[PDB]
Design a protein around this ligand. Structure first.
Ligand SMILES: Cc1cc2nc3c(=O)[nH]c(=O)nc-3n(C[C@H](O)[C@H](O)[C@H](O)COP(=O)(O)O)c2cc1C
Length: 128
């Protein structure tokens, strides 16, 4: 669920400033809760700091290329919370362009992968 109303009180995202080398300019409350990092470790930084051992170099290259090309993208990447816990991050990226069509910012929406249970599916599919 995206390309739909987005606020911090519900969602996990960050916003990068393309005019400052894609440094994060804003992070939702969910982002801090998910990663365990606080603003002092995030604002002004690049989100690559979440990557670590075993993060897939070819998925990282696909992200880098999508951003350079100004394209939307998603891919699952291994990331690490502040305590060193690995987690799978389903990262969706979307450019933000000005009226001249230049990329000025990127939004990144992260979803920490959790197991989806037969019970949760029953709830999703449960009629009417
Ligand atoms: C808005 C935005 C959000 C991002 N969020 C994450 C993230 O949650 N985890 C991550 O590993 N990389 C994230 N990235 C990707 C890195 O910032 C970086 O673009 C990627 O590692 C590829 O560039 P590099 O090869 O220079 O590291 C995000 C990028 C952007 C632009």
């Amino acid at each position: 669920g995206s390309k739909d109303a987005l606020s911090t009180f519900k969602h996990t995202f960050v916003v990068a400033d393309a005019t400052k080398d894609m440094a994060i300019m804003y992070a939702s409350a969910g982002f801090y809760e998910m990663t365990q990092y606080g603003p002092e470790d995030v604002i002004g930084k690049n989100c690559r700091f979440l990557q670590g051992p075993g993060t897939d170099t070819e998925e990282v290259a696909r992200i880098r290329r999508a951003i350079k090309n100004g394209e939307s993208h998603c891919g699952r990447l291994l990331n690490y919370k502040k305590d060193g816990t690995p987690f799978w991050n389903l990262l969706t990226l979307a450019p933000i362009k000005n009226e001249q069509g230049a990329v000025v910012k990127f939004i990144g929406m992260q979803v920490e992968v959790t197991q989806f249970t037969e019970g949760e599916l029953e709830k999703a599919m449960r009629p009417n």
